[PDB]
Design an enzyme around this catalytic site. Structure first.
Site, PDB file in Angstrom:
ATOM      1  N   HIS A  41      14.882   4.272   1.694  1.00 38.12           N
ATOM      2  CA  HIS A  41      15.450   4.716   2.972  1.00 38.12           C
ATOM      3  C   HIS A  41      14.476   4.548   4.161  1.00 38.12           C
ATOM      4  O   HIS A  41      14.900   4.738   5.297  1.00 38.12           O
ATOM      5  CB  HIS A  41      16.052   6.135   2.925  1.00 38.12           C
ATOM      6  CG  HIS A  41      15.059   7.238   2.757  1.00 38.12           C
ATOM      7  ND1 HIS A  41      14.262   7.658   3.806  1.00 38.12           N
ATOM      8  CD2 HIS A  41      14.819   8.020   1.680  1.00 38.12           C
ATOM      9  CE1 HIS A  41      13.537   8.656   3.327  1.00 38.12           C
ATOM     10  NE2 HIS A  41      13.833   8.904   2.049  1.00 38.12           N
ATOM     11  N   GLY A 143       8.700  14.070   6.705  1.00 36.66           N
ATOM     12  CA  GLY A 143       7.509  13.247   6.552  1.00 36.66           C
ATOM     13  C   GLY A 143       6.973  13.233   5.130  1.00 36.66           C
ATOM     14  O   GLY A 143       6.171  12.364   4.779  1.00 36.66           O
ATOM     15  N   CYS A 145       8.600  12.478   2.403  1.00 37.12           N
ATOM     16  CA  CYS A 145       9.241  11.448   1.562  1.00 37.12           C
ATOM     17  C   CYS A 145       8.215  10.476   1.032  1.00 37.12           C
ATOM     18  O   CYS A 145       7.323  10.082   1.768  1.00 37.12           O
ATOM     19  CB  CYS A 145      10.352  10.723   2.315  1.00 37.12           C
ATOM     20  SG  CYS A 145      11.609  11.818   3.024  1.00 37.12           S
TER      21      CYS A 145
HETATM   22  O1  LIG Z   1      15.630  14.912   4.014  1.00 37.25           O
HETATM   23  C1  LIG Z   1      14.795  14.165   4.525  1.00 37.25           C
HETATM   24  N1  LIG Z   1      13.483  14.463   4.603  1.00 37.25           N
HETATM   25  C2  LIG Z   1      12.859  15.640   4.162  1.00 37.25           C
HETATM   26  C3  LIG Z   1      12.294  15.776   2.896  1.00 37.25           C
HETATM   27  N2  LIG Z   1      11.826  16.921   2.389  1.00 37.25           N
HETATM   28  C4  LIG Z   1      11.906  18.005   3.147  1.00 37.25           C
HETATM   29  C5  LIG Z   1      12.445  18.028   4.455  1.00 37.25           C
HETATM   30  C6  LIG Z   1      12.542  19.207   5.236  1.00 37.25           C
HETATM   31  C7  LIG Z   1      13.107  19.173   6.479  1.00 37.25           C
HETATM   32  C8  LIG Z   1      13.590  17.982   7.003  1.00 37.25           C
HETATM   33  C9  LIG Z   1      13.506  16.820   6.286  1.00 37.25           C
HETATM   34  C10 LIG Z   1      12.934  16.805   4.985  1.00 37.25           C
HETATM   35  C11 LIG Z   1      15.234  12.814   5.081  1.00 37.25           C
HETATM   36  O2  LIG Z   1      14.173  11.975   5.521  1.00 37.25           O
HETATM   37  C12 LIG Z   1      16.498  12.130   4.626  1.00 37.25           C
HETATM   38  C13 LIG Z   1      17.719  12.504   5.161  1.00 37.25           C
HETATM   39  C14 LIG Z   1      18.900  12.012   4.646  1.00 37.25           C
HETATM   40  C15 LIG Z   1      18.868  11.133   3.582  1.00 37.25           C
HETATM   41 CL1  LIG Z   1      20.354  10.709   2.810  1.00 37.25          CL
HETATM   42  C16 LIG Z   1      17.654  10.710   3.065  1.00 37.25           C
HETATM   43 CL2  LIG Z   1      17.601   9.589   1.747  1.00 37.25          CL
HETATM   44  C17 LIG Z   1      16.471  11.208   3.584  1.00 37.25           C
END
Ligand SMILES: O=C(Nc1cncc2ccccc12)[C@@H](O)c1ccc(Cl)c(Cl)c1
Ligand SMILES: O=C(Nc1cncc2ccccc12)[C@@H](O)c1ccc(Cl)c(Cl)c1
Ligand SMILES: [Cl-]
EC number: 3.4.19.12
Lengths: 301, 305
Positions: A41, A143, A145
């Site tokens: 992603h 961040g 990920c």
């Molecule tokens: O959920 C995400 N990151 C986070 C990860 N881990 C914790 C987070 C906490 C708050 C905000 C974001 C966080 C996103 O980067 C994301 C959104 C939608 C999709 Cl479908 C995908 Cl693959 C990835």
């Protein structure tokens, strides 16, 4: 003596964390040999979050679109491919800090250490379990990920998880290092819900054995149960069924403490019925389910 | 989202762990520059430990009596000296993996990460607090002596603890890296008991702020209290006194959540007098006191090392 939630030493994994930037998105990558692994992603925009066609988006990308940073050194991407939900970026330098490693897919109930990273820099290490609903109850901010879950076998790092996203309930979903998601999750912003979570029964029993090994015996009783009667009671408290595999796995702890598995199962049934009555087990007022039978043996003996 | 007990990344400290063997005793050493630090009780025997004269035992030892192993390479000890309860072994080789570091003595309530080691090899990392009774509720087996406690401040490791022993209650006692014990403990086989422990009040409040930041708000109430009325209640429940320094330190979390510290204290006061009533805070049925205000800010804002 003592019993703590213990993570593996994170040094072998810290030397693999890099920052991967694609356009406006920056996340973490795992640099092993001449390959940087990260969630696919990272190639997505705002318009691509609901229904991304990753094959289509990746074909439009060039190697110079991926900015990889290992410390204060930019690595040169010489290739890119996708394996399921993971992006593999071939780089022109093998990571000199690459440890002995394997990619392992784990089952629910299994534990691992998470090295939480932001901008390719490790900020913390904690211990997790793959929940029966295939989510992990992590501690992650935006961040994070690309942060990975791992175990260490002597000198070998077994990478078992890569963080992809946070579900609406605040729990986390991700993949193994081959890009296959744990659970019925997809890397799209489509409405996704974690299934009702349940307690990892085999791990609670392992933790009750850890408490006995540490001198905590108050919860023991004179009863035993059939496996079927235990499961009928367990299910009512949203506890995972205990299989004959789990009974077998608890065998060494059963032999060490002298308490049969079905005997410990009757202690657990009583705890579910009575609660703790102001008492604690290993300094906890709740039944802990994020220690596997293997974790208990390793930590106690 | 989420709140976990999180330790600092242990890599900078893993590159310093060595195995120190003296006669029949094998424990861990911390190799920084050309010095290996380890508990001085490594020079003791069964009889010696009962009433040891460490100056006398050390004078009898030669450099070749200390076998130091860094991985599969033996280091040669070129000197030995004692600083309080720590033994300092000068080696011929400076540790090329020596990070930027400091030796810091911490106060009760402060947290740190422990890198548990056996035979100079790291096996686990966990986060814990220096209890008000100066013990740590660690997870250690025989062979863990010399394992260290640390914090990371930017790119600098602050070594704050070295494991020496386990008390009869299963809790642990050790020293700072200058060999000074935390608590009224001694490194000798004698009757020693940890004093009655108390709860680290400032840390519980910091953890209540972490729960609010994570959406757990059921324990919040309309009330406020005074630092004096609260301390009278806190003392009654074996909670450490909350000082104006603690109130000031909790300021940023108070500003972020919109809940004044004395407002959070009235919530803590009700939690103590009434319990959780079957509810949990951050998945816990007990009030957690091993997260400092800085730990909560670091975790709920993602500071890296
Ligand atoms: O959920 C995400 N990151 C986070 C990860 N881990 C914790 C987070 C906490 C708050 C905000 C974001 C966080 C996103 O980067 C994301 C959104 C939608 C999709 Cl479908 C995908 Cl693959 C990835
Ligand atoms: O307590 C010890 N080690 C352990 C440390 N930490 C945990 C242990 C768990 C089980 C067994 C031993 C453990 C001893 O090696 C020891 C005994 C007496 C004294 Cl006075 C001193 Cl300084 C040290
Ligand atoms: Cl602060």
């Amino acid at each position: 003596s003592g019993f703590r939630k213990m993570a593996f030493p994170s040094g072998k994994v810290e030397g693999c964390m890099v920052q991967v930037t694609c356009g406006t998105t920056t996340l973490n990558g795992l640099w092993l040999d001449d390959v940087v692994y990260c969630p696919r992603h990272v190639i997505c925009t705002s318009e691509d979050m609901l229904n991304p066609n990753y094959e289509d988006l990746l074909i439009r990308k060039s190697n110079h679109n991926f900015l990889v940073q290992a410390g204060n050194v930019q690595l040169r991407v010489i290739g890119h491919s996708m394996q399921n939900c993971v992006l593999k970026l071939k780089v022109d330098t093998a990571n000199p800090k690459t440890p002995k490693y394997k990619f392992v897919r784990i089952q629910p109930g299994q534990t691992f250490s998470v090295l939480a990273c932001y901008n390719g820099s490790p900020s913390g290490v904690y211990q997790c379990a793959m929940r029966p609903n295939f989510t992990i109850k992590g501690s992650f901010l935006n961040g994070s990920c690309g942060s990975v879950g791992f175990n260490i076998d002597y000198d070998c790092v077994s990478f078992c998880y890569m963080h992809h996203m946070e579900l609406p309930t605040g729990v986390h979903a991700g993949t193994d290092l081959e890009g296959n998601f744990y659970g019925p999750f997809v890397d799209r912003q489509t409405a996704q819900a974690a299934g009702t979570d349940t307690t990892i029964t085999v791990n609670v029993l392992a933790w009750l054995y850890a408490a006995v090994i540490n001198g905590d015996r108050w919860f023991l009783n004179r009863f035993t149960t059939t496996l079927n009667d235990f499961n009928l009671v367990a299910m009512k408290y949203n506890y995972e069924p205990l299989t004959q595999d789990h009974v077998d796995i608890l065998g060494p702890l059963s032999a060490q403490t002298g308490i049969a598995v079905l005997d410990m199962c009757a202690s657990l049934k009583e705890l579910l019925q009575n609660g703790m009555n102001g008492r604690t087990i290993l300094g906890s007022a709740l039944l802990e389910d994020e220690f596997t039978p293997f974790d208990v043996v390793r930590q106690c003996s």
